[PDB]
Structure 1
Amino acid sequence: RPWQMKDLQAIKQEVSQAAPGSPQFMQTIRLAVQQFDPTAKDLQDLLQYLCSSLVASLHHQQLDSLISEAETRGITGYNPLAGPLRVQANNPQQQGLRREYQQLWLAAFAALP
């Protein structure tokens, strides 16, 4: 049951004033993601929806660095021989992957300033 249009518009409107990485932005986005459990595809939809392309690029760089760090350290069930981290997360049989991807996404978003 991925978010429809109205859910995403409520999400966008509530955070009009707050700048990326602010506590309010992070709070609301954390609620949304932890309520809907969206795969990487849908998180990309949301990120391209809310902020500009510059913020998306910054987030992508930060998320790539975080993926490298937390994948060399180790992940509970990351089998990197069966596809990249993004693809495994989007599989609906890899709940752990979805959870870790969501946490990495949120950390990268919070790590702008």
Structure 2
Amino acid sequence: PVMHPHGVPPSHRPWQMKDLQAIKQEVSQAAPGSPQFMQTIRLAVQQFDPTAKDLQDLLQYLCSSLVASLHHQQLDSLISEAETRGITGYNPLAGPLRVQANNPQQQGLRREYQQLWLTAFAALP
């Protein structure tokens, strides 16, 4: 999660097991892929403002290894397509998008990464 304390720069903090349990319960209160599901996962992403690594770690906790890998596969294709067209605040010279999305200061890029990560569920059966 990325914290936004008043005044000081934003900072990253690891998931707490209670955070992940809370998200798991909220998500499990809706059928996977359903409109209420996608709404719940999006609201959880808003709550914790996670980095790219945070999002990967969350799915690793929520889903089976192969299903989380399927998401990663779908997201990688979305990222490639997004990189071809250009992404807000992304210069390939500063490193891979997934790595840049882990810099707490790059909010605009993190938020766009979050939207791509959310979009990649559109395939998850």
TM-score interval, normalised by the smaller of the two chains: 0.7 to 0.9
Q: TM-score, normalised by structure 1?
A: 0.88
> d(CA) in 2 for partners of 1:57 and 1:4?
23
How far apart are 1:104 and its partner, in Å? 0.4
How far apart are 1:75 and its partner, in Å? 1.3
Equivalent residues of 2:88, 2:112 under 8 A apart: no
Structure 1 residues 38 and 56 mapped into 2: Cα distance closer, same or farther (>3 Å)? same
How far apart are 1:16 and its partner, in Å? 2.9
How far apart are 1:55 and its partner, in Å? 1.2
- Which consecutive segments of 4 or more residues in structure 1 shift more than 6 A? none
How far apart are 1:10 and its partner, in Å? 1.8
Residues 85-108 of structure 1: CA distance to partner in whole angstroms, max 9, x if unpaired? 011010112111100110000000
Count of residue pairs the alignment pairs up: 113
State percent identity of aligned pairs. Answer: 99
How far apart are 1:3 and its partner, in Å? 4.5
Equivalent residues of 1:3, 1:36 under 8 A apart: no
Equivalent residues of 2:60, 2:68 under 8 A apart: yes
Structure 1 residues 94 and 64 mapped into 2: Cα distance closer, same or farther (>3 Å)? same
Unaligned runs of 5+ in 2: 1-12
Q: Which of the pair is proportionally richer in helix?
A: 1
Equivalent residues of 2:101, 2:113 under 8 A apart: yes
How far apart are 1:27 and its partner, in Å? 1.4
Query: What is the DSSP-based 3-state SS (H/G/I as helix, E as strand, rest coil) of the residue aligned with 1:13?
Result: helix
How far apart are 1:109 and its partner, in Å? 1.6
Structure 1 residues 2 and 37 mapped into 2: Cα distance closer, same or farther (>3 Å)? farther
Residues 6-42 of structure 1: CA distance to partner in whole angstroms, max 9, x if unpaired? 2221211233364542223211110010121100111
Unaligned runs of 5+ in 1: none
